[PDB]
Structures are given as structure tokens and as C-alpha cells.
Symmetry: C4
Subunit: 353 residues, 4 copies
């Protein structure tokens, strides 16, 4: 039985080695965060508008000014190859078939260049800064290979304390490789090419990356730039003031700070304050979750684990199936609440509980 996202999670758990499933499903510390990410959606219920002609419905919507099939994206997730062979490509091709963007992780198992050469969809690149020079190299590589949008993830200044991984002594699968860091030379002896080599031999990001550094990144990247990992309207607003074209409210799927608020708690405020695109992720599993966020003003919702369950359970086809179910889910929900055009969603369709 594969009728919803949970069904794929169940199948994924049956097919993945425990260590890998825990890497995927686990959250930080007590996992109160991942639970809160799910529970917060119950803070809203629907107030359908009846007797509305919903015979013709549209899920098409502009994201950052560019039209796509539906307000969804497959968000950046690292080590996809540990879930399914060539996982990054499977996800990218499924997203492309569905008419939505795919975001490649800095910690992907397929390189920026290789993906761009094997997929003609709308590819976005998610950046993690470990070393400024190396980051610049990846950004320029993404630019030259056709990536349309750059996403800076800011919520992993230090690694999250995921206790399942500690219990399992989780180690990156030996057959896997952080492809984007491949060929970053060596032998070079001197400050950089030493301070860099040392940085790469460390599983820690550049914790000093601040607003000033964002300005640097803004000048380097000429296209759309989003800042991911924000949990306040104030930070979202500052990002816009610093040059960002939009933001992605997110708590990294409860994988970094267990007691972090859910981004849903500051969605409406961020939308009202910034006046710019506010995308969101963390906890989305049902079409109703997605519609609630869109009704509150979100430009689009990025999927993390939802599509990864499809990938881990049935590869590319599994991802296609999850996207198909979610699209039919969103469509069904729109019809049921009396909002035929997804772009017409508003808070008026919701009741705060």
C-alpha cells in the first residue's frame, strides 16, 4: 500500500540498513523538534468556501518570478547516494518530470557539473561555506554550468547533536564521496592550500560567516539568491536588506537544534515584514501541510524527507510517485476548500486552533 508519504517512509525503513534509515529520519537530541514540526500543522484547520466552481483548477505558480508546475521543490539534502544509487540524479530527474526545481547539496554525491550535464531541469545549488576560496570555486562552477539559483544554508555553523548517529557510530558510506570537493588539489604548500587543506580535513563549516560575508556572496552571484535556515522575520528582513531575493524559513528538519521553533511559527510575520518571497520547509508530509503554508503566504514549500522516502524505497520512480501523490493531494485539497487557483490562497481559508 503506497497511498501517501508515510507509506513510503514505512517501505524505506524496510529497505534501508538501520544506520542509514536513522541518518535519514533522525533529529537532534530528544527529537522533540521533529515532532513539533509535525504537530504545529494542527494549529490550523480549514474553513472551505462552498459553491465555488472548482471544475478547472490550477497549481501553476511563479517562484521567484519564474513559473513552475506547482509551488513545490525538492530541497537540498546531502549524501543522497547513501539512500539510493545515483540518488541525486534520480531526485533531479523526478523533479524535472514534475516541472519543479531540484536543489543540489554541497554535500551531494554527484558533482555540480555532472548533474548539469545529465539533467536539463531547473537546477538550484545549495552552498555550505567551509573555506571561502573553495566556496567561491563551487559558486562559479554552478554559475558556469547553468544553475539558476543559489541557496546559502546558514543553520549548520556547528554540527547538530544527532544521537542516533552517535549510537550507530554513523560513518559516511565508503562507496560514497563528497564529489564537489574532488580535485581541490594538494601538495600546494603555504597559508592557503594549507589553511584550506586543514579546513577540508575538518567536518566543520566556517562559523564566522556573517552578514558581511553574505554581502561578499551577493556580489559574487549574479542571479537569484536565497538564504536558508532562518527562524525569525527580523533575520528574513535583514537578508532582504542585504541583497537576498528571498529566504527559506527552516529548522533543517529538526536535525540541528531540537528546541528550535517551527518555521511555521514565523511564516505569516516574515511574509508581512519582508514583502519578498518567503519559501519554507521542515515537517511537510501531507498536501494539507503544504496548503496551510501557502495560505499563510509562503511562495513555495521545499520537500526534504518526503521525497527521500520515495527515493530510498523505490528510487527515481519512487520520487515520481511521491510527487504525483502530493500533487493530486494539493489539487484535491484546493477543490475541497474552494480555491481552484493555488495562487488565490489566503489566510481566510484557515481557522487558528
Amino acid at each position: 500500500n503506497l497511498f501517501n508519504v508515510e507509506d513510503y517512509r514505512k517501505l524505506a525503513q524496510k529497505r534501508l540498513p538501520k544506520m542509514v534509515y536513522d541518518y535519514l529520519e533522525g533529529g537532534a537530541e530528544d527529537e522533540y523538534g521533529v515532532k513539533h514540526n509535525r504537530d504545529v500543522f494542527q494549529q490550523w484547520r480549514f474553513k472551505p468556501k462552498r459553491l465555488v466552481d472548482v471544475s478547472r483548477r490550477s497549481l501553476q505558480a511563479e517562484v521567484l518570478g519564474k513559473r513552475q508546475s506547482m509551488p513545490l521543490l525538492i530541497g537540498p539534502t546531502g549524501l543522497n547516494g547513501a539512500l539510493w544509487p545515483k540518488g541525486d540524479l534520480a531526485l533531479a530527474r523526478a523533479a524535472t518530470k514534475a516541472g519543479i526545481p531540484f536543489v543540489l547539496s554541497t554535500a551531494s554525491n554527484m558533482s555540480i557539473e555532472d548533474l548539469a550535464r545529465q539533467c536539463d531541469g531547473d537546477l538550484w545549488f545549495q552552498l555550505y561555506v567551509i573555506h571561502r576560496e573553495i566556496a567561491q570555486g563551487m559558486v562559479l562552477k554552478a554559475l558556469h554550468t547553468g544553475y539558476t539559483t543559489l541557496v546559502l544554508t546558514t543553520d549548520v555553523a556547528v554540527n547538530g547533536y544527532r544521537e542516533r548517529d552517535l549510537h550507530n557510530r554513523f560513518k559516511i558510506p565508503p562507496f560514497l564521496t563528497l564529489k564537489n570537493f574532488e580535485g581541490i588539489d594538494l601538495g600546494k604548500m603555504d597559508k592557503a592550500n594549507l589553511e584550506m587543506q586543514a579546513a577540508l580535513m575538518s567536518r566543520q563549516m566556517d562559523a564566522s560567516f556573517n552578514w558581511e560575508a553574505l554581502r561578499w556572496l551577493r556580489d559574487l552571484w549574479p542571479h537569484k539568491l536565497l538564504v536558508k535556515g532562518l527562524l525569525s522575520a527580523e533575520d528574513a528582513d535583514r537578508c532582504i536588506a542585504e541583497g537576498a531575493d528571498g529566504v527559506i524559513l527552516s529548522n533543517h528538519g529538526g536535525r540541528q537544534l531540537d528546541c528550535a521553533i517551527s518555521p511555521m511559527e514565523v511564516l505569516a510575520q516574515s511574509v508581512a515584514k519582508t514583502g519578498k518571497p518567503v519559501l519554507i520547509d521542515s515537517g511537510f508530509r501531507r498536501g494539507s501541510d503544504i496548503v496551510k503554508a501557502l495560505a499563510l503566504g509562503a511562495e513555495a514549500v521545499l520537500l526534504g524527507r518526503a521525497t527521500l522516502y520515495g527515493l530510498a524505497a523505490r528510487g527515481e520512480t519512487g520520487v515520481d510517485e511521491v510527487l504525483t501523490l502530493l500533487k493530486a493531494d494539493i489539487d484535491r485539497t484546493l477543490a475541497q476548500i474552494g480555491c481552484p487557483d493555488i495562487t488565490s490562497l489566503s489566510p481566510d481559508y484557515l481557522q487558528n486552533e
Copy 2:
């Protein structure tokens, strides 16, 4: 032990094939809706008025201006024949013996005409519009056979995603038939009698039926007209403005949209705004649930699953028993809260929790 509605649910589950019980009991998606429908009643508790003479109590009340034994009705439910042989007739006869109306579903297993010929009680007809022409035929048939009231159900523009049915591959019992669509001719070749035949060969309602279409229905039906499936005081008010004589607040027993609010959440507001009869259903199981709704202003409460448990467990007699228990329940509750005349109920007997 058959002392309340739950006892009949338990017996019904023991006597019905799993597939059928799931069709009856199931809700949309995660079934958070059916649970919420039950839980919402705990938002109110009673503040009895003591030392009131309750030696003489009355449950008699006018519904749409017409007096009936108690403010209850057996609401429209499809495929009753799958629960018990000639289920529609059993329910109708039980309702008639209890002195309350029975609402026949468009998806009933006994035709509009056959029921009217075999039951002299107050029969109401619930309409689903798949094809305008066919709907008109049913409405006129109900009119000519003595049905007093017409109920338009508006919350199934598209089919609900009930996962139990998907797991069981639920298929309408072969010995059952949507009798009201019987004899709708064929062979006829041309636009209609083709666009119609195609519509009937589709398990989907007319999703375009809107306010304009309601105006059409209002002109076709000369007697009392109610719109069912509303979940907002605004929609209820618009229905009255468009000609309706009252409304039925309802989320279809949590079978259509899992995250829909419970109609109890907008009952008081709808009563205050419309100033017209506001009936309600969804989640009612105990007399206290019913009394709470009546105290908040509801004109009457329609029973869905409650009487179906009686039907599935013990046929017509089972329905008689459930109605008898509920009547004694309501009566007992009125005595206990110090409101001898059911028509005297008000919010003053309740405490918001």
C-alpha cells in the same frame, strides 16, 4: 450490553465484513478529523440550573417551522443497503416511528419513489448534482412523490481521500445498486444523452456547481431548501441570501477533508449571523453532544453513523433502539441541567473550557 451508541458500534464491527465496517467508520487521510469531531465537544461543560421543576419535560420542537418529536433527524447516508438489507427503509421506518424526519441520499439503494410508497413519515431528499438534467429529474421526482424538504450537499465537489477504502480496494457491493440512477435511458446519441452518459460513467460530481447554480435549484424546488456541508457563518449567510430556508453545518463526518474544522466551531456564529435555521451534524454520539449544539442555537442535529451502527448491528429494531436511547439520553440531560423544555436551551447552560 447495548446501553449507548458506542455499544452498537462495537456490535456493528462484529457483524459487518471488515471492508464494509471500514467504509462506514473511516475518515479522510489521517482521521484526525473524525477525532477532532468527537474531541471538540469537550470544549464545553454543563452548568446545571438547580431547583427547577423538571417533573414535566418536553423534547418536542419545530424544525423549519414544523413540529417533530425531538430535534433530531436521520441524515443522508449512501449505500445503506450495504449495512443491512433494505437499510434505507429500515432507517426511514425507525425515524417515522420516533417522530422525526429521514433524509434519503442520492446514492441510496432504494429509489425515491419506492421509499415514498412504503413509508408515510416526513421524508427529505438529499441531492448530489452529477448532471444538471439528471438532478432536475430527481428533484422533480422527489417533489411529485411527497418529499417535504430538499437538501443540497455541497462538500463532495471531488471525492474524499479515504485510505481505508484504498487499502481494502473497496468496491460497491455487487448486490447493491444506485437505484436513483436506474432507467436514465441510453442509446440516445447526441450532446446530452452522451455528455450525460459520460457523467454517469464517472464517480465525480459536478465540481462547477456554484452560487448561480444554487439560484437555479432554488427556482426549481418550491418547498423548504437547505444547503448542507457548510463550515463558515459567511457561507451560511450567503445561502440564506440566495434563497435557502436554512443550512446544515457539516464536515461530512470527517470523510472528506481531514483538516476541516468541526461545524461546532462556527455554530454560534452562524446562528447569530443568519438568523435562520442552522442544523448541524458530524461527531454526534451522546445526548450531551446534541444538547450542547442545541444550547448553542442549532435548530436540530442530524445523525449519521450513530443510527447506522444500530442499523448494521440489528437492522430496523437496532435503529429504533438507538433512537430510544438517544431520546432518553436527551431527556435525562435536560432534567439534569434544569431545562425541562428543550426549546428553552441557551448558552447559559454551558461553560467554555
Copy 3:
């Protein structure tokens, strides 16, 4: 292990026949009421006052102007003889040894006269009116035998729907008798002594007893009169206006109306509005429950099941033990919150949660 009331409940359940334990412990319908009666106490927590000299503490307090050892009473409960032989006397003697009043039920197994002859403590009489003439007889009997206070119970206009009793086909123990109705003659033929005989052959109270009837009772009884079963400050106030010397807020231990509010919900309001003694019962098990009610203004707390567990488990000694534990509990609590004199309790020691 017998260190609190719950320990006695556990022992009582082990020693009583299931039917009897269910009669004792059971509540109306779903028993959400008895649960709410317990849960409501968690709506308040303590804010102790430190560095207060609590070396000398006093639990002595006036109830209706008369001093007693502590602000507790053993409330009226019927069929005590079904829990332990001569249960009414055991409870009365334990209450007397503890220095608190005992309230005899109209449905006691020991007569008004017999108890008064075998116990010299402060005896109160709880009245149920089935027949006016018979009620007058009992009231006069209580008056002539030394009962100091009369309590009219108003919350059983009709019998509660206790489903455990229905499942067990509960029948008053054959070796038991409603002693207070003994010798009410017969053979007499005519209106009364016929309308009366019929009333006694019915397990139903006089549902017509109203405010006018209370006035009649007020004129018949010359001493302190309390009205029990109130659940609103308005009713409590009316009782005072009609002549009552105080009231007992109560939902009959969740045995009559499952969805009734807990009396704790209207305690403070009743105290402020009436300006007269407001006693309370329903749900009290821990000394902290009792102290919370007293802090909110209650004159005294009546125990129902708490002391009955002591009785059912270990007879008179069991009741003595429960009262001893509760007294030590209240004393300990007073010391811990910094209120050495129980009469000094106020809302300032509480925090609303």
C-alpha cells in the same frame, strides 16, 4: 503499603465484589467527569511563602460558625452498609474521633434515630425528597434526635446513567435496607398513603422540587440549612437569598452528569458573590486538593470516596487511618507553603496554570 488515599482505593478494589466496587467507583456515562474532577486540580500550583515561622500550626476552623478540628467532613453517601458492615456507624465514629461532622444519607442503611443513639458527634442529615410528607417526617425526626445541620441534595432530580451498574445489573444488596423509609405504614387507602406508597415504589425523586419548595423546607428546619449539588455562583446566590445558611458546590462525584463542570470552576466566584459559607466536594483525594479549595475560599471540603475507600478496605479503623493521613497531609502542606494557620489561606498561595 497504605500511605495515601489511592493505596486504600487499591485495597478496597481487592476486597470488594466487583459489582460493589463499580457502584462505588463508577461515574456517569463515559466517566470523563470523574477524570475532569481530578484533573482540574492541576490548574493550580503552589507559590510557598518562605521564612515563615511554621513551628506552631493550626488546622482548627469554624464551619458555619462552629469550630471543628479541621475543615473537612465525611459527606453523605448512600448504601454504606454495602461497603462494610454497619458502614454508616463506622464512618460516623471515625469522623467523631477526628473532630469533624458526619453527614447521614437519606439512603443510609442505619436509621436517623439509631445513629443518633449510637454516636455523640456532630451529625448532619442529608435530605432527598421523594414525597413531601415523608421528607417532612425525616426532617422532623432528624430535628428531634439532635442533628445539627440539614443538607438538601438537589442534583438527583432523575437518576444518573452509570453504565457500570447497567453492565453489572447492580441490585441493592439483599441484606441491606433503606432504613429511613422503614415503617412508613401501608394499608392506608386514599390519595396520600397511595400517592405516597406509589412514590416509594419508585426509584425516582420529586423532580418538581423547586425554589418555592425550598422556602417550605426553610420554614420547617430551624437550624443551619445547606443546599448541595450547585454548580454556579448564581444558584448559590439564589440559595442564600432564599434562606440557606450556605451551600455545597458539587457535581455528586461525577456520578450524575458526565459533562458537568467541576465545582472548582465556580468556587472563587461563588465565594465572592454569596459572601456566605461555600463548602465543596467532588474529586478530592490529596491534601493539596483540599488546600487549593480552601485557599480559593471554601469553608470546608466534604469527602466522598476518599473515606469510603478506608471503610471498604479496613472498616472504621480504615476510615480513621484515611482521616489521619489526610490531616497530616494538610498539616504538612500548610507548613510547606508557609501558612501555619489554616484560616489564613488565600489565593496568594496559588498560581493559575
Copy 4:
């Protein structure tokens, strides 16, 4: 697996005799208090500040004007020797190695003098007053041996009703001794040295110790003085008015009054009202709990059971490990919420839930 405090609790439960584990883990009566102490932390979630340079973080902070490695302390707990041999010394040495103070209990198994001679860290002394003369002796002894701070615990005027201890008939381990009361002479015959001997032969504190007595203690002790066990901003303020240099909000880890509020409920108010150091304990297990309290204004958090689990499970090394984990936990949390300097914490990093 020893990755957090709970892991040490699990190991401690496996290594300690049941009686001892219950003495350690148990709470008063129903233990709703210890549960509330944990649950209250979920009333706040984090709103991280992104793009803040957190490459250089500092946990150093002044407590009562004196700098220490982090805003933590190992609080006073009695009978540590029952958990691990020379438990008091193990805890003291671990605290000293971590750069934080250790508070010796009046009911310690190692004397004030012996500890001071074997540990050169910052030692605090917690006082319980059973007899004024004896208390003075201990205070002077602590003064002469180098203890920097005196803590008066005021929440054990009477002993808490811990039912686990009652069930286990808990008796202070025979190989243990209340060392601080050793050599308090005898044979002396007359008022004191009789009223004193009797006081020592009683497991009850001086319940008369009030504000006047605090003034006496204030004049006796020349250094920093804190009052522990407060649960209101009003009491905290009075302590400052009476001469205290700060307070410790605490409910004694839910071991004294089950229905006591959690000190977290009055932390912000106490900080705002007193304008003096407000330390706190009760319920702290995760670094996030600690950071929430510090963000609300707490000067420091005292650990009770957290470090005792380390002690009971693995002795001194276990305590070292727990402190190491908590420090890394706090550090990680600071980085994640964007507050590199622990002294910069404020309510702005929190969201009330």
C-alpha cells in the same frame, strides 16, 4: 552509550540498589512535580540569530561577581556517599576541574573541614538549621576553612512526603554518617545540650526560622549569602531587602511539595524585581534547559540529579563526563542560536509557546 544526562541516569539505575536509586530519583507524592519541572522547559523554543560570527565562543561568566568557567554549579545534595564512595569529594573535585563551584550539603557524608583540606576549588556551604547554636558552629567552621559562599536552604521546614522511600522503608546507609554533626558533644546536662541533643535526635529542621532569623544569619556570615528554595519574586525581593546577595529559585527538585510551581515560572519576574543575582535549579537536564534559564536572566544554574547520575554511574570520572557533555552542549547551543558570548543571552532568543 553515554552521550547525554539521561544515558547516565540509565546507567545509574543499573548500578544502584533500588532503594538508593529511588531515594535519588524520587519526588514528593504523585511526582507530578518532577514531571512538571521537566515539561515546563517546553514552554519556550529558540529563535536563532543567523549569520552571526560564532567562530569564537565564550562560556565564561561572573557569578556573584566572581568569574568561573561556565554559569553552572554542582548544587547541595545530601548523602552523596550513598551514591558513590567519598561522593562529596568526587563531586567537588569534578566541579573544580571544570572550573565551577561545588556546594557542600549540611547532610554531607564528608565534613566541612575534611573537604576544605582535600579540595582547593571554590567551595560553598549549604546550611540547614536544626538548632541555632549548632548552625552557628557549622557556619563559623565553614568561614574558618575557606568556604566562599553560604547558602541557606529554606524549603524543608518539614520533611517532604516521598512515597518511594516509604515503600522501601528507606534508611540512611549504615556505613554512612552525617559527618557535620559529629562530635557535637553530649553528657552536658542543662537547657541547651539537652534541647540541642533532643533537636539532633529528631529528623526535623527548625520550622520557626523566619525573616528575623535570617537577619541573625546575615550578621554572622561576612561573605556572599544566598537564600535557596524560593518560589516567588516577592520572597526573592524580601531576601535582598533583608541582606542577601542573591537567591536560588528552587522547588528542591520536586522532592518537597509535589504541586509547587517550577522556579522557571517566576524566573523572569524575580530577575526584574530584585535586580540582584537570581540563580536557579530544579529540572535541568539538557544544555537547552540551562540556556533558556540564562536567557531569561538567571545568573547561573545549579545541577542536582544530573551530576549525581554521573557520580552514581561512574564516580568522579562520571561527574567529569557529565560536566564535559553539558559544557559542550551549552557551547553547541550558543553557536546554534547565534549568541557566541554566554553573557549576551537575552529573552530575544526565545519564543513563548
